[PDB]
Ligand binder design. Structure first.
Ligand SMILES: NC(=O)c1ccc[n+]([C@@H]2O[C@H](COP(=O)([O-])OP(=O)(O)OC[C@H]3O[C@@H](n4cnc5c(N)ncnc54)[C@H](OP(=O)(O)O)[C@@H]3O)[C@@H](O)[C@H]2O)c1
Ligand SMILES: O=C(O)Cc1nn(Cc2nc3cc(C(F)(F)F)ccc3s2)c(=O)c2cscc12
Length: 315
């Protein structure tokens, strides 16, 4: 509808605002505008290095009595350098301190790969390989469950897990909480049908990231594929008298996914919200699904030999 139910009974807004690459100097105004426009879900992470500034916006709007806390669905994520069981609570509390909140709605394992603990987000050796840590997804999951038990987070989940990694959590001895959500890259050029079918079949809500193809990702080249400029998608938009962004946001919604487009531009933040008053046809949905090229925006070559690297599997 406009929300999907999670395994804890919470209603997750199907549309949220993404914050990766939203600079600290611009993000506060972006989140204020988004809340005004009607977004009730913000996707955050410690590695985005902007949680303080998102927190400022949230507090402004709570103080303005625009929203109360219970009407917001705030997501953040545990960065790769904090997979050690003993570091998880501190990481969560730092995020909470930065966001100026007392709890998160959802806290995710950001990637299945643990990285060497320390002050660098991407610890590299002298040949530029990311340095891994002696951590594993099951032990980290156990530490995530403690956060629920402690009341710091309402729901926990995973991000960028392949179907075997999801399976490993579900099959964990002594599992206490099933993951609520798996947040994965999803757009017409990477449709993920098998992994979505798997996750949904298992009662895990899927959130689609990079739904516009992340045209501002820092490793994009001007010649790379571009969803917003794909003339085939432009045609589908024109037929509905919508923008290509609206089509791209609507597409995951009709697959029963949560979607989290990012913008720091007020006009676009508003534009991107106007997706609840039209429907893509069956033909439109099939056509968009047929553009799948297994083209992935978010992967790092410097991690491909990690034991937990998620993208060697078919799904
Ligand atoms: N879990 C993970 O590992 C992971 C990985 C990637 C992303 N994510 C999450 O998913 C969110 C969304 O993915 P993303 O940031 O990679 O990219 P995205 O949402 O696919 O694309 C954002 C880009 O599209 C532009 N844009 C947005 N609305 C527009 C519109 N209506 N017209 C034209 N251009 C438009 C933005 O420009 P402006 O901002 O300048 O307006 C920005 O350059 C992230 O911010 C983050 O919250 C999670
Ligand atoms: O992690 C995000 O949400 C987006 C993101 N994505 N990436 C690309 C990444 N790919 C991976 C791949 C892995 C893995 F699991 F495949 F090894 C782990 C961490 C990363 S981060 C970045 O380099 C980066 C710098 S700040 C935010 C990012």
């Amino acid at each position: 509808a406009s929300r999907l139910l999670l395994n804890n009974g919470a209603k997750m807004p199907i549309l949220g605002l993404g914050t990766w690459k939203s600079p600290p100097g611009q993000v506060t105004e972006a989140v204020k505008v988004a809340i005004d426009v009607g977004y009730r879900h913000i996707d955050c992470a410690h590695v985005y290095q902007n949680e303080n500034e998102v927190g400022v916006a949230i507090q402004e709007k709570l103080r303005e009595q625009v929203v109360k806390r219970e009407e917001l669905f705030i997501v953040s994520k545990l960065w790769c350098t904090y997979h050690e069981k003993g570091l998880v609570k501190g990481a969560c509390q730092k995020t909470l301190s930065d966001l100026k909140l007392d709890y998160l709605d959802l806290y995710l394992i950001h990637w299945p790969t643990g990285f060497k603990p320390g002050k660098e987000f991407f610890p590299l050796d002298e040949s530029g390989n990311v340095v891994p840590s002696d951590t594993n997804i099951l032990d980290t999951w156990a530490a995530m469950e403690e956060l629920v038990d402690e009341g710091l987070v309402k729901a926990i989940g995973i991000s960028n897990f392949n179907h075997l990694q999801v399976e490993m959590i579900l099959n964990k001895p002594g599992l206490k909480y099933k993951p609520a959500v798996n947040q994965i890259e999803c757009h017409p050029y990477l449709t993920q049908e098998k992994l979505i079918q798997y996750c949904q079949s298992k009662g895990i809500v899927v959130t689609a990231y990079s739904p516009l193809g992340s045209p501002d990702r820092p490793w994009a080249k001007p010649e790379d594929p571009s969803l917003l400029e794909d003339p085939r998608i432009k045609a589908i938009a024109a037929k509905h008298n919508k923008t290509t962004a609206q089509v791209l946001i609507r597409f995951p919604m009709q697959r029963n996914l949560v979607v989290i487009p990012k913008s720091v531009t007020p006009e676009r933040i508003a534009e991107n919200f106007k997706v609840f008053d039209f429907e893509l046809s069956s033909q439109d949905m099939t056509t968009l699904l047929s553009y799948n090229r297994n083209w992935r925006v978010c992967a790092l070559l410097s991690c491909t030999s990690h034991k937990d690297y998620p993208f060697h599997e078919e799904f």
